[PDB]
Amino acid sequence: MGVRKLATIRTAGEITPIAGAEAIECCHVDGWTCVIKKGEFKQGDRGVYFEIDSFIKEDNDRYPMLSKQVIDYEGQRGTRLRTARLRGQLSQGLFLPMDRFPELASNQVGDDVTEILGITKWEPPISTNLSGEILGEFPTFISKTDQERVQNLIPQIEENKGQKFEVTVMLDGSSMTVYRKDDHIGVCGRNWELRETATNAQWHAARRNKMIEGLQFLNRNLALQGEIIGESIQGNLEKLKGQDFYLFDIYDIDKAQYLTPIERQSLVKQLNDNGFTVKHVPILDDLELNHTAEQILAMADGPSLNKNVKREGLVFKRLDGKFSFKAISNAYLEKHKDR
Ligand SMILES: Nc1ncnc2c1ncn2[C@@H]1O[C@H](COP(=O)(O)OP(=O)(O)OP(=O)(O)O)[C@@H](O)[C@H]1O
Ligand SMILES: [Mn+2]
Ligand SMILES: [Mn+2]
């Protein structure tokens, strides 16, 4: 969805020493924790925070601390920021003081500086198993699947205290959307509506679980959104044989809004009552929110759909369907260096 805010002006939170490493210290930036050089910031200072996945073009003047990690990526020379562990200290992102960015002297706390600093987004490769023939743009009348990170929602998490959330396991696969709009039924990946052919994985998942017939039956303008997971998709964390679709959302095209967890669970039951075989992402107990970002992140480690593997994380969706976010497990990002 759109353009992610990879580089933004943010405020130095609590600064804590790293025992046994005098030259560095730990800086809290929103719900992120970042290793910084001793002295670069005091608590309350502003800086440009670059999130993990930032791709930072080689620059020995501005980004000398990245020199050793410069790779070749999409025909560009630069550095991919990723989760790391230093001295036993979890570190994610880069935080650089404002006087490194004279062109940002008149900007404000909160501003997105991704474009102006020419930062781009690194991402894992698409499973060429799932790059299909493109029929069309992702429909403008359906929301792309997107969840903000809990680390970026400190004030929101505060505000939602007392609110109840559906908790589901975050599956690591590829987003897929199967929808009906009047006389058209279509299957999309994360970014594009796809043509049906013999080798198209998403179309095949949709036929196999009878989800097009399912949409024909409900006779509503609805987009069924879920994760296609399994063999040859993002390394197959779940150790499935073959591939399959797990629903996580239903988007009401005529109303332009997501269905609430309750409405969504009812439709899935009716679908399955009528023989349409739609599986859902694993649903945990509802959570009454009363937590810091750090506590939410602790919860995110745990078993997956396959209980013998550690999950990518958890997705929280408010019972009214209008607020949601993801807590990616930091254990998972430490275990999986291509994440
Ligand atoms: N239980 C779930 N609830 C909602 N989405 C889920 C769930 N399980 C897996 N997903 C997938 O999680 C994705 C959102 O988080 P994810 O980190 O995978 O996004 P991304 O597209 O890699 O974007 P970025 O990493 O740039 O933020 C959705 O696009 C969807 O495909
Ligand atoms: Mn991602
Ligand atoms: Mn994903």
Q: Which of 144, 171, 247, 318 to mutate to test the pocket of ligand 1 (most atoms within 8 A of CB)?
A: 171
In the numeric block, which tokens belong to residue 139? 């429909």
Segment (H or E) for 328: strand 324-328
- Nearest residue (by CA) to ligand 1, atom 20, is 146
This structure was determined by X-ray
List the residue whose alpha carbon is closest to atom 31 of ligand 1: 175
Locate the ligand 1 atom nearest the alpha carbon of residue 121 and give its number: 26
Tokens of 25: 């210290």
Tell me, in angstroms, the distance from the centre of ligand 3 to residue 189's CA.
12
Phi first, then psi, for residue 168 (nearest 5°) are -125, 155
* Ligand sitting nearest the alpha carbon of 146: 1
Q: Note the residue count of the chain.
A: 339
Strand order in the sheet with 32-37: 15-17, 24-29, 32-37
Q: Which residues of 294-303 are buried (b: 16+ CB within 10 A; e: fewer)?
A: eebbebbeee
Please tell me if the CB atom of residue 225 comes closer than 6 angstroms to any atom of ligand 1: no
| CA 103 to ligand 1 centroid distance, Å | 34
Question: Residue 225 Cα, ligand 3 centroid: separation in angstroms?
Answer: 13
* Phi, then psi, of 214 in degrees rounded to 5: -60, -45
**In a 10 Å sphere around its CB, with 0-12 CB exposed, 13-18 middle and 19+ buried, how is residue 337 labelled?**
exposed
In Å, what resolution does this model reach? 1.9
Query: Which residues have a Cβ under 8 Å from the Cβ of 127 and sit 6 or more positions away?
Result: 174, 232, 233, 234
Q: Phi then psi for 218, rounded to 5 degrees?
A: -70, -25
The full set of domain ranges for the chain reads 6-124, 125-145+173-281, 146-172+282-339
314 Cβ closer than 6 Å to some ligand 1 atom:
no
176 forms bridges with which residues in the sheet? 226
Residue 26 C-alpha to ligand 1 middle, in angstroms? Answer: 28
Residue 4 CB–ligand 1 contact under 6 Å: yes
Q: 59-73 as b/e, with b when 16 or more CB fall inside 10 Å?
A: eeeebeebeeebeee
Residue 330 has φ and ψ, to the nearest 5°, of -70, -30
227 lines ligand 1 (CB under 6 A): yes
Closest CA to ligand 1's atom 10: 170
Q: Would you tell me how many other CB atoms lie within 10 Å of the CB of residue 163?
A: 16
Cα 91 from Cα 100, distance rounded (Å): 21
Cα 261-264-268 angle, rounded to 5 deg: 135
Q: What is the SS3 assignment for 157? A: helix
* Per-position DSSP letters for 127-153, written without gaps between them: -TTS---EEEEPPTTSPPP---BGGG-
Nearest by Cα to 268 from 232, 231, 222: 222
Ligand 1 contact via 171 beta carbon (within 6 Å): yes
Phi, psi of 18 (to 5 degrees): -105, 110
Query: Rounded to an integer, what distance in angstroms lies between the CA atom of residue 171 and that of residue 8?
Result: 28
Maximum C-alpha span of the chain: 66
Cα-flanking dihedrals φ and ψ of residue 325, to 5°?
-155, 170
Partners of 79 in the β-ladder: 56
Q: How much helix, strand and coil, in percent to the nearest 5, is found in the chain?
A: 20, 35, 45
Cα–Cα dist 177/224, whole Å = 6
Nearest atom (ligand 1) to Cα of 1: 21
The whole-angstrom separation of Cα 95 and Cα 34 is: 7
